[PDB]
């Protein structure tokens, strides 16, 4: 078992391991489209010869609080052969890619986790929260206060330009936003086709400042699933939900959204927007603590404050936050805040409160005033959302 | 149909309407215990004679941010006969009790809603959030960082004093906390008995600084339901969860908790603490805007700021917040923030963000800086929880 | 929003609205086959430009009691864009088509309702009843009295002529019968093909005087679904059910039939033919009360009688019924029977009893003798059935 | 944490731990009846004071192949407080009881396992197999060859003597048979009463040479559950099943029986007796290898043979089997068969084949002829059954 | 209704009856591949003309105890038209094929039964047992004693030669083994392809001495179904199960295996390998009692013994068994053992014990010593397995 960058010869073995490893496997043609996002030396394989281990990263652009865009290494296509469990192959592959990612100059790495108990040990913390809402739309009435026909029902394939422009405005404004390159729009509008024996046809609801893609469920013919809703203004968001509640042949509309989705508040009965499912979305590994902490914006409400942050096996820093900006410098002074690297990734986009992690002792300080100040400073004005799975 | 305070003669008719109206009806003896919390003139009935309408309030003590305790009118036992729907009986009863509550000097009223689409119109806003967690405890491993045998398995009836003392410390520290009077401890430790053909026996896990009451589900014999967990320190909270994960005959532990429960963070796999259910807990009606706004503490992080708040059909106030305190005074100056009374009740304990309600247009301002300052000021340092249903 | 007859340019927009509106959407090629049944000026669209509203009628031939065939306008493809709910588009489209249908000389209009609470207001009453029977065929034994190998198992595509001839004899004899044109036989024998990932292959049971088309359910491989059973004699009906009970690999046979299906009575245990589902089939709007009332046959058993029938906003008539025939003439004499137009459509084919509608006060008279006579006169000798959905 | 024999003072703490540990807890009165089977020094408790650990054994009589009855220590009431998991309390309690059991002169210990992954490490092997059969009795027809009204429907409480005499004949003839003392007959005929909100009334089917106790399921009113069927002759077994298939109001009869139950072979369709569930019944720990191996009968079919058996940390023996008897003597000669103690317990009553355990390498030899001879010798002429849970 | 061998003209009618009779119908192309195994005069049809009845046999090679291979007639494609039930068509077809099979020189016939209550009357007895195991692989840990990366994850289509060679070694060693001809390998590796709207892609786990073919379930995406596992050594069997338990994205692995599968014993918790389903596999009809009884090996453990066996309407024989061989000769001496022909087929491969069939009176003797000797003699050293369905 040796670890190396794959050759063109390795890719059929990698597709075999992928097919056996991922039930939702996009297939070889779709995988070749995603490969365009993998930089030279972005992939590792383990051979025993046949491929028993693989991992790669993609070049991504992640929006963080303050509308700042970071170069981000997106880990994906991570698989160990069922024949080679418990031989340290994942630890070896993650160590090699992290070395390359760090040397390449990426301040953060990100991934979507297949299981929740794996990536904490490699320094990844869950940084966004997926929240499924199911609306029983037969009972749904809009509140007198709710904004609002500016919405059109359209064929997705015919309005790509308009989707692309709205999404581009969306992703620059929202923490968790990702640049979506051309190949991923090619892949998205191909999944919008009805498949024989698979997913039904997708429709779009199109506003000047928002869109929703939805399809009826394969089996439950009274359920509409919203695959994607991107709204740049509150008017667009409300207009799109007026149109979705107007699907009079459905009993239920479901969407995977974020905890601060205002939909419940648009209705006279907030309870009709039931939370049916919750899960970690994007996981972050802070590769470079100083570059990451200095890059994001902080809340202007909290007054200037200074502390000493230690990350376990990741450095100790004098951290000064004021006027929405942070300066993070090396120091050997006594730490006032200690935490593992994963905990920092969980705080970084504003999804988890420092005081909540402190209550579980994932984050240690003897100053409760400092906890309150961290909480307020790392909060995001714009609620953090999840762009797309990779 | 006339509206009046019930006589002793009215109470069998009220119990009949209760029995027909509430499936979870506590019964006449339990109801007579709760009656001790109803003040003279705390109840109204509508006669056609027989009782076709009733409503009452109880004298409660609610903890709000800054560890401040407010006298609170708890609406309960609200029922209209199925024979007298759509005759305005609820509107008439709510108007009469609100008059009495306001004249009596209560700054806030509260209730638990049977449905979500009813009480918004009478000025009640959902102020706390119930969050059910289900843990598959067969997979649960505590994180290296988690605190921690200080916990004892005990019979609830034998440790009432200890439960009472822990709960009393809990409710004074936590927004949403309610004083639990003797009659409600009498009722709680009677529901801890096994019933023939009903609920199984309750056990307690007792720490110096926390307790958990739990019972196996009637039908699902691999599910333990935690009815109540009160923990005054993080050590107590973690110790109690170590003991509950040690119920080796159960597959699943469920609890109704709050969104900021640190349990997920105590585990190596945060995902094992699944959110299976979410709902509005306590609803608040702010009876007196100035008395309520001046009574609670505000976050010390936000700098002194001033604005003009209008509540629809509820006054206009010059609101000045600084050094964690608010001054709220009458004014005829232009409003900078407008909202219905229910919206204010939703903001009041810190469960809902002003910027989330603004996105749904439940709260209108033309200053986004002011929105950020309201958000930060109305935030609660201690996460808001739900004490007990009434 | 203006209302007009569609141009050839409008039909892709109409197919888009159809696809988004109907989950069971037959698709553009199948829809173009059905278009052959739509007369010139049989369709309306609403443009905002894009199609936000459509409705059309087809030229049909409906059999009514006395084996009389009426020209019938079959409303279909009725859809409002989810973006344009609650703007009166359905009321405007139904008013325009009803004007055209009435001017064209149709005595009745008909439809199949997607929901039960919509078409009553436009004068449509449910006129036939669908009754699903599920037979646990493992227990089914034929009664000593039951008639009866004259039945052949065949490929549907190879015996079209024989199906067509049996159906043609069936539809002329039975109230609810519809002429089935060539394009609908083309469509029926195409749905008899197995689809990859969809419905399984259809088989036929063929008798000289009856046929049954059946297929195994997609998911429940022990359920056979009879899509269509047409039997012109009792011998044919019994023979076909002997063959279906002989599907020894099935546990259950289901069929959508009518309330008077004699199948339960063919068995030693009538209970084995369980009623699993009931619903309104065909809805009727009587366009011209006199032409419709004079056109159908009436029961020869009831003696000659005369009354005055008023239809709300639909005329007042002197109605004389004797010798199985009715004469319906204008009058200003006092009404003895009043009812909304929808109620008349419900009475017209014999599926609902006048005395049942009277008990709900949908039909008012002060003469109970007259009620008994209406009941007996409007009864159908041959039980009313449902031909095919449109 | 110290380990000692319980005092009379300890038993309320033990009942509390029992109640919290066992959902099917028989209760304090029933537990006091079972206590009569616990010898002086048959119980251990761990105190921290409160009871955090308990275990005991009962004096039992187990029938092994050759109709030989062994004194048997039945481990039961084994519980560790959920507050004291992972502190070695079970290992400490099992070690102390095993010392006492061995010193007392018991050749074998037995238990029923709450989980399958626990007791292998303490030398217990699963020795009997529970097999649930569910008969769809609506289809059940007896074979022309099946024996056979000698069976009476009776009230259990009125025929105790007759049940006791049949069971006593049953348990002396069958490997796995246990003596059932008076206190357990007291407990059995008390569970035969209908409980308000619990189990329905039990009935008995009584033959001169067999009985069946059955009751309708609490929730599934078309399921009869046979709690116990004891038949000393094939005639009795068949007669009792003729009576149970005659419960014409039931769809299904279920019983927990053994893999060699001849019921399937009594029917024309063997498939109607579906195996719906399988599990380990009784677990055995061989305390004394020589006393246990010499005590049971062996199959007379296999010719005299000799080998050397080693049990891991349990001795090495020259084992000579011939004329249905074994002689087991100490030796230092090379082992021909090696196995852990648990494996021996699994072989001992004839439920598991030596060649099946060898295929999993739980039992090692380099002689396949010796494997065949062990298989044939340890086989039981009478199929092994499970008497009652303890 | 006349009975004859089909002409080439008959085969479209036979495919129609097949399609209507078998839901799992392989289709006309797959059926034409299987036809290559049908000898000249291996098929009968009944015409009324159209095909209302068919049956055929295939030339197979069945392994019986002692590694002896018998020519075997495999009955298949047996169907009666649902229009011709209860006219004796099956009895007539089975009688004609049995005449041909017997005259052709086959000692045994075999089939897979669609129902359990049919083929006993034609002399077929169930001879193998299918046992579904479902492993919750999340809990599965291998025992310290379990053997063991020699296993490779591969594409089935690319390793046909290797599968064929392993299977060929497997089928010669195991009772129930069948020769698998080229056409059936063609058919197997075509079912290994993903179908649009049907089964997902198959993967292989390949060892020098074993293979497993598995696929994820269509609907349950956490279930892996092992279609086939063939292991010639215990090492191969254990290695393949280590690889299958390493499918970390699955919760459950299911396999249809045999009752003596050692998998449960490879695990620390035997209970994790749950038996979820049990059914008769292969049915045998002994065509020639003497040729069949003399052909198989018998257990060398039982000493030489002699008896007189009568088969009902099948002969009486002096049966002498010693040194693993039987001599079976005609006699008119008193029978000591009587049984129907089906019972003999059930005993023949060792799946059912003579003493179990005797307890149901399917097998009559007055000598219990003789029963014990039959049991021991007809036992199979190698556990009987089921090769493939036909
Ligand atoms: F060569 C490759 C490079 C990158 C990749 N990542 N794609 C993986 C992926 C994950 C989730 C979805 Cl919803 C869609 C695609 C796949 C292949
Ligand atoms: F006279 C009465 C005065 C007050 C009351 N409120 N109790 C109502 C109530 C609601 C919920 C629970 Cl879990 C328990 C009790 C009931 C009767
Ligand atoms: F252009 C068109 C004209 C008429 C139509 N009606 N067809 C609609 C329809 C409804 C139900 C079924 Cl089962 C099948 C078809 C559809 C399109
Ligand atoms: F003090 C005691 C001594 C022995 C015991 N064992 N009984 C335990 C037990 C287990 C299973 C059943 Cl179905 C019934 C009872 C219980 C208490
Ligand atoms: F012409 C034919 C000759 C023999 C046959 N037998 N095949 C039948 C069959 C049964 C089960 C399976 Cl899993 C696969 C195939 C089918 C047609």
Residue C347 is assigned to a structural domain of this protein: yes
Q: Which residues contact B11 (CB under 8 A, 6 or more apart)?
A: none
Is C203–E84 a contact, with Cβ atoms under 8 angstroms apart? Answer: no
The reply to whether residue A21 touches residue E197, judged by beta carbons under 8 angstroms, is no
**E16 interfaces chain C, CB cutoff of 8 Å:** yes
Determine contact, residues A362/B265, Cβ cutoff 8 Å.
yes
| DSSP conformation class of A75 | E
Q: How far apart are CA B3 and CA C331, in angstroms?
A: 53
Alpha-carbon gap, residue C227 to C244, rounded angstroms = 12
Cα separation of C306 and B294, whole Å?
Answer: 81
Task: Using the mean position of ligand 2's atoms as its centre, give its distance from the Cα of residue B78 in Å.
Answer: 10
CB-based touch A/C (3+ pairs, under 8 A): yes
Q: What is the 3-state secondary structure (H, E, C) of A117-170?
A: CCHHHHCCEECCEEEEEEEECCCCCECCCCCCCCCEEECHHHCHHHHHHHHHHH
* Pair D133, D276 in one domain: yes
Judged by a CB distance cut-off of 8 A, whether residue B159 touches chain D is no
- Residue that the structure tokens 């074993």 belong to: E210
| Beta-sheet strand order (sheet of E315-322) | E325-330, E315-322, E305-311, E337-339, E363-364
Residue A362 DSSP one-character state:
S
Q: Which of D246, D263, D285 is the last residue of a domain?
A: D285
Across the interface, whether the CB atoms of A269 and B145 are under 8 A apart is answered: no
Q: Which of these, E386, E18, E389, lies nearest to E171 by C-alpha position?
A: E386
Counted residue by residue, chain A has a size of 390
Residue A390 lies in a domain: no
Going by C-alpha positions, the residue among B327, B333, B339 that lies closest to residue B308 is B333
Q: What is the DSSP letter of B54?
A: E
DSSP strand pairing (C68-80 vs C108-112)? parallel
Integer Cα distance of D295 and D289 in angstroms: 10
Resolution attained, angstroms? 2.3
Tokens coding B335 = 């409003």
Domain count, chain A: 3
Mutate to test the pocket of ligand 2, among B31, B74, B187 (most ligand atoms within 8 A of CB): B31
Question: Which residues are C277's β-sheet partners?
Answer: C132
D268:E360 CB<8 A: no
Q: Which of A84, A87, A114 is closest, CB to CB, to E249?
A: A114
Report DSSP state, residue E386: -
Active site residues per annotation of E:
119, 390
Both structure tokens of C368: 């109970």
Contact between D316 and D307 under an 8 Å Cβ cutoff? The reply is no
CA-based nearest distance B258→chain A, Å: 12
Which tokens go with D342? 């648990």
Say whether both E196 and E239 belong to one domain. Answer: yes
Q: What angle do CA A245, A246, A249 make, to 5 degrees?
A: 100
Residue E335 CB less than 6 A away from ligand 5: no
Q: What does the H/E/C string look like for chain C?
A: CEEECCCHHHHHHHHHHHHHHCCCCCCHHHHHHHHCCCCCCCEEEEECCCEEEEEEEEEEEEEECCCEEEEEEEEEEEEECHHHCCCCHHHHHHHHHHHHHHHHCCCEEEEECCCCCCHHHHCCEECCEEEEEEEECCCCCECCCCCCCCCEEECHHHCHHHHHHHHHHHHHHCCCCECCCHHHHHHHHHCCCCCCCCCCCCEEEEECCEEEEEEECCCCCCEEEEEEEEECCHHHHHHHHHHHHCCCCCCEEEEEECCCCCHHHHECCHHHEEEEEEEECEEEEECCHHHHHHHCCCCCCCCCEEEEEEECCCEEEEEEEECCEEEEEECCCCCCEEECHHHHHHHHCCCCCHHHHHHCCCEECCCHHHHHHHHHHHCCCCCCCCCCCC
For position A142, which CATH number holds?
3.40.630.30
CA distance B90 to B79: 8
For residue C29, the ligand closest to its alpha carbon is: 3
Binding-face residues of B in 270-329 toward A, CB within 8 A: 270-272, 274-275, 277-280, 299-303
Touching check for B79 and chain D: CB below 8 Å? no
Q: Are residues C239 and C342 in the same domain?
A: no
Same domain, D211 and D134: yes
Q: Answer yes or no: do C246 and E82 touch at CB < 8 A.
A: yes
Q: Any idea which residues of D carry the catalytic annotation?
A: 119, 390
> Residue D127: CA atoms inside 13 Å, Cβ hemisphere, count?
32
Q: A270–B116: do the CB atoms touch at under 8 Å?
A: yes
> What's CA D297's distance to the chain center, in Å?
19
Same domain, B360 and B324: yes
Q: B215 C-alpha vs ligand 2 centroid, how far in Å? A: 22
- Confirm whether C110 is domain-assigned: yes
Q: Is E361 on the interface with C (CB under 8 A)?
A: no
Nearest residue to A209 (alpha-carbon basis) of A174, A170, A176: A170
Greatest Cα pair distance in chain E:
68
Give the residue from C264, C280, C296 where a domain finishes: C280
Domain encompassing residue C226: 128-280
CA of B197 to the centre of ligand 4 (A): 22
The DSSP bridge pattern shows strands A223-231 and A252-257 to be parallel
Q: What 8-state DSSP symbol labels residue B97? A: H
Give me the helix-helix angle, D11-21 and D28-35, nearest 10°.
Answer: 120
d(Cα C371, Cα B54) in Å, to the nearest integer?
45
CA distance B364 to A229: 24
Q: Specify the length of chain D in residues.
A: 390
Whether B152 sits inside 8 A of D83 (CB atoms) is yes
Triad C133, C134, C135: Cα angle to 5°: 115
Residues of A in contact with B300 (CB under 8 A): 372
What tokens appear for D364 in the block? Answer: 């090692």
D372 annotated ligand-binding residue: no
Confirm whether A9 is domain-assigned: yes
The closest alpha carbon to C33, from C185, C192, C198, belongs to: C185
Is A253:A137 a contact under the CB 8 Å cutoff?
yes
> How far apart are alpha carbons E214 and E206 in whole angstroms?
12
Pick from C280, C303, C326: which residue ends a domain?
C280
Cβ pair E8, E51 in contact under 8 A: no
Q: Which of A24, A50, A82 to substitute to test the interface with E, most E CBs within 10 Å? A: A82
The answer as to whether A69 is a domain residue is yes
Catalytic residue status for A77: no
Q: Which two tokens stand for residue A239?
A: 């207009």
- Report chain B residues whose CB lies below 8 A from the CB of A280: 270-271
Residues B215 and B174 occupy one common structural domain: yes
CB contacts < 8 A (C, E): 49
A115 annotated as belonging to a binding site for a ligand:
yes
* E367 has a chain D CB within 8 A of its CB: no
CA-E32 nearest atom, ligand 5: 1
With H, G, I as helix, E, B as strand and everything else as coil, classify residue B73.
Answer: strand
Our answer on whether the CB atom of C192 is closer than 6 Å to any ligand 3 atom is: no
Contact assessment for residue C308 and residue C337, using Cβ atoms and an 8 Å cutoff: yes
Q: Is residue B390 part of a domain?
A: no
What is the distance between the alpha carbons of residues D365 and D371, in angstroms, rounded to a whole number? 8
Give the method used: X-ray
| DSSP 8-state symbol, E313 | T
Q: Which of residues 124-153 of A touch B (CB under 8 A)?
A: 126, 139, 141, 143, 145-147
Q: Helix, strand or coil for residue B363? A: strand
Which of these, D353, D282, D301, lies nearest to D124 by C-alpha position? D282
Question: Whose CA is closest to E342, among E176, E126, E175?
Answer: E126
Of A268, A275, A353, the CB nearest to B120: A268
Sheet holding B203-207, edge to edge: B152-154, B203-207, B210-216, B223-231, B252-257, B129-136, B273-280
Beta strand D51-64 with D43-47 is antiparallel
Whether the Cβ atoms of residue D191 and residue D199 lie closer than 8 Å to each other: yes
C-beta of residue E108 within 8 angstroms of C-beta of residue E285 = yes
Query: How many angstroms separate the CA atoms of E390 and B323, rounded?
Result: 84
Are the C-beta atoms of residues B126 and B356 closer than 8 Å to each other?
A: no
As a whole number of angstroms, the distance between CA A308 and CA A334 comes to 7
- Gap between the Cα atoms of A125 and D168, Å rounded: 65
Q: Are B133 and B90 members of one domain?
A: no
D24, D53 in Cβ contact below 8 A? no
Note whether C149 contacts E82, CB cutoff 8 Å.
no
Q: Output the six-digit token pair for B326.
A: 């608010």
The answer to whether the beta carbons of residues D292 and D286 sit under 8 Å apart is: yes
Q: Are residues A188 and A256 in the same domain?
A: yes
For ligand 5, is residue E386 a contact (CB within 6 Å)?
A: no
D abuts A (3+ Cβ pairs < 8 Å): no
> A142 and A109 share a domain?
no
| CA angle D286–D287–D291, rounded 5-degree value | 80
Q: Are residues D119 and D179 in the same domain?
A: no
Binding residues of C: 78-80, 86-91, 114-115
β-strands B223-231, B252-257: how paired? parallel
Do D88 and D212 fall into the same domain?
no
Alpha helices in chain E (DSSP H): 11-21, 28-35, 89-104, 160-173, 182-190, 234-245, 263-266, 289-295, 341-348, 354-359, 368-378
* CB neighbour list of residue D262: distance below 8 Å, 6 or more residues apart: D234, D237, E356, E357, E359, E360
In this structure, is residue B192 part of a structural domain?
A: yes
Q: Is C317 near ligand 3, meaning CB less than 6 Å away? A: no
Question: For residues D68-84, b (16+ Cβ closer than 10 Å) or e, as one string?
Answer: ebbebbbbbbbbbbbbb
Strand-strand pairing, D152-154 and D325-330: unpaired
Please say whether the dihedral angle defined by the alpha carbons of residues E22, E27, E33 and E35, taken in this order, is positive or negative: positive
DSSP A33-74: HHHTTS-TT-EEEEE---EEEEEEEEEEEEEETTTEEEEEEE
CA distances from D86 to A9, B89, D89, D192 (A): 50, 60, 8, 40
Half-sphere exposure of C70 (CA within 13 A, CB side): 31
Of the ligands numbered here, which is closest to the C-alpha atom of D23?
A: 4
Distance A79 CA to ligand 1 centre (A): 12
CA distance A219 to C208: 39
Nearest to A14 by CA among E246, E208, E153: E153
C97: phi then psi, degrees, rounded to nearest 5: -65, -40
> Going edge to edge, which strands form the sheet with C51-64?
C2-4, C43-47, C51-64, C68-80, C108-112, C282-286, C125-126
Q: What are phi and psi of D236, to 5 degrees?
A: -60, -45
Residues B137 and B168 in one domain: yes
Task: Indicate which ligand has the atom closest to the C-alpha of D24.
Answer: 4
Q: What is the 3-state secondary structure (H, E, C) of D318-357?
A: EEEEECCEEEEEECCCCCCEEECHHHHHHHHCCCCCHHHH
Instruction: Give the N- to C-terminal CA distance of chain A in Å, as an integer.
Output: 27
Q: Which of C15, C106, C119, C163 is catalytic?
A: C119
User: Residue B388 falls within a domain, yes or no?
Assistant: no
D143: exposed, middle or buried (Cβ count in 10 Å: 0-12, 13-18, 19+): middle
Q: Report residue A319: phi and psi, to 5°.
A: -110, 120
Is C214 one of the catalytic residues? Answer: no
Main-chain dihedrals φ then ψ at residue B20, nearest 5 degrees: -75, -20
For residue B368, the domain's CATH number is 3.30.1050.10
Partners of A363 in the beta sheet?
A: A339
| Cα–Cα distance list, D257 to C114, D165, D351, E235 (Å) | 53, 20, 13, 34
Flag if A197 and E200 touch (Cβ within 8 Å): no
The minimal CB distance from C155 to the residues E16, E85, E197 is found for: E16
Distance CA C55, CA C78 (A): 4
How far does the centroid of ligand 5 lie from the alpha carbon of residue E63, in Å? 20
What strands, in cross-sheet order, belong to the sheet with A252-257?
A152-154, A203-207, A210-216, A223-231, A252-257, A129-136, A273-280
Contacts of D325 (CB under 8 A, 6+ apart): D294, D297, D298
Q: Could you give phi then psi for residue A212, rounded to 5 degrees? A: -130, 130
Rounded to a whole number of angstroms, the CA Rg of chain D reads 22
Q: Which of E106, E22, E13, E128 is nearest to E57 (CA)?
A: E106
How is residue C213 written in tokens? 């088309």
End-to-end CA distance of chain B: 27
């Amino acid at each position: 078992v040796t670890l190396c960058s794959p050759t063109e010869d390795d890719w059929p073995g990698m597709f075999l391991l992928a097919a056996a490893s991922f039930t939702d496997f996009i297939g070889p043609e779709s995988a070749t489209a995603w490969r365009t996002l993998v930089p030279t030396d972005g992939a590792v394989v383990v051979r025993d010869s046949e491929v028993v281990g693989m991992a790669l990263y993609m070049d991504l652009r992640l929006t963080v609080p303050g509308e700042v865009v970071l170069p981000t290494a997106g880990l994906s296509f991570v698989a160990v052969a069922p024949t080679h469990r418990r031989r340290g192959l994942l630890r070896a592959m993650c160590a090699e890619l992290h070395r390359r990612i760090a040397d390449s100059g990426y301040p953060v790495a990100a991934l979507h986790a297949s299981e929740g108990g794996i990536y904490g040990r490699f320094g990844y913390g869950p940084a966004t929260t997926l929240h499924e809402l199911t609306v029983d739309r037969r009972f749904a009435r809009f509140h007198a206060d709710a904004p609002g026909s500016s919405v059109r029902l359209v064929r997705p394939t015919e309005h790509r330009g308009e989707f692309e422009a709205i999404y581009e405005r969306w992703r620059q404004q929202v923490p968790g936003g990702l640049l979506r390159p051309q190949v991923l729009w090619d892949e998205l509008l191909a999944e919008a086709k009805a498949a024989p024996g698979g997913d039904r046809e997708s429709f779009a609801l199109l506003h000047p400042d928002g869109y929703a893609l939805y399809r009826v469920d394969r089996t439950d013919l009274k359920l509409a699933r919203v695959s994607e809703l991107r709204a740049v203004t509150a008017d667009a968001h409300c207009a799109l939900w007026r149109a979705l509640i107007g699907l009079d042949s459905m009993e239920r509309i479901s969407i995977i959204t974020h905890p601060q989705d205002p939909l419940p508040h648009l209705l006279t009965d907030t309870r009709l927007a039931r939370t049916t499912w919750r899960q970690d979305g994007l996981w972050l590994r802070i590769m470079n603590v100083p570059a990451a902490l200095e890059a994001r914006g902080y809340a202007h409400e909290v007054g200037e404050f200074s502390t000493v942050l230690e990350v376990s096996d990741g450095g100790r820093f004098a951290l000064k936050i004021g006027d929405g900006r942070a300066r993070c410098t090396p120091t050997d002074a006594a730490a006032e805040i200690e935490m593992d690297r994963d905990v920092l990734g969980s705080l970084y986009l504003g999804a988890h409160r420092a005081s909540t992690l402190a209550a579980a002792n994932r984050l240690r300080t003897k100053d409760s005033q400092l906890l309150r100040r961290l909480d307020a400073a790392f909060a995001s004005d714009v609620p953090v959302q999840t762009a797309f799975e990779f």
